[PDB]
């Protein structure tokens, strides 16, 4: 598709992470109303999370379990399906974290300059052997455990297998880029957000997003759906394969 969609969220303010999953319930972080929203439907729906201050990067699992960088409260908190109830997970030592990606957990911890990773079940917290970070954001992770991190500070994207070599994928010209997303081909989609634009990888492309104002966070979907969060606009936008 060329044309986009704009999903019939309602009272967004600064929206900034968005997150999708496999029945295409789309969840996007309403950073300044402190809540995460979700759409199964027309009508959204908010998580009853309790206590997010400027909350940022939002991802889901199969079983619908939701998690929420809490950015203002240097947390990370999840919410299973069903739940009144969310958990904190046992991260320590993060400032101002970012992104969130998933048993395993992943979070750009944006004010140390490096992402850490919960393992799952031992609770043993490392941090992955990125080097040269620079105010990180955006983070993703693929089946094969390969790790993206959009580094927001030097205007690049880098990934790192499940290894001691990273490598700096071949965008070009990102300007204070944000969100980044990887589909099952192994594209690789960035919110180029100082450019208001979007591109992938497959040759860069820039999506035809129309009327982007500072976007923020991607999501893809098994078919190829693109959904991004047009921040400076408060809305959200979508573009169907």
Known sequence: ????????????????GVAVDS????????HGNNRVVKLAS??????????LNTPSGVAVDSAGTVWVTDHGNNRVVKLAAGSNT??????????????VAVGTVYVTDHGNNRVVK????????????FTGLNTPSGVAVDSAGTVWVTDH??????????????????????????????????????????NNRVVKLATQTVLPFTGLNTPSGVAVDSAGTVWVT????????????
Do not use: E, I, W
């Open 153 to 194: 500070g030097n205007n690049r994207v880098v990934k790192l297998a499940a290894s001691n070599t990273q490598t700096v994928l071949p965008f070009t010209g990102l300007n204070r880029p944000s969100g980044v997303a990887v589909d099952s081909a192994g594209t690789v989609y960035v919110t180029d957000h100082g």
């Open 118 to 129: 919960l393992a799952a079940g031992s609770n043993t917290q490392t941090v992955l052997p």
């Open 1 to 16: 598709s060329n044309t986009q969609t704009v999903l019939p969220f309602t009272g967004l303010n600064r929206p900034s």
């Open 23 to 30: 029945a295409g319930t789309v969840y996007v972080t309403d």
């Open 86 to 99: 969310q958990t904190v997970l046992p991260f320590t030592g993060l400032n101002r974290p970012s992104g």
């Open 42 to 51: 027309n009508t959204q729906t908010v998580l009853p999370f309790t206590g």
């Open 230 to 241: 047009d921040h400076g606009n408060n809305r959200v936008v979508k573009l169907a394969a």
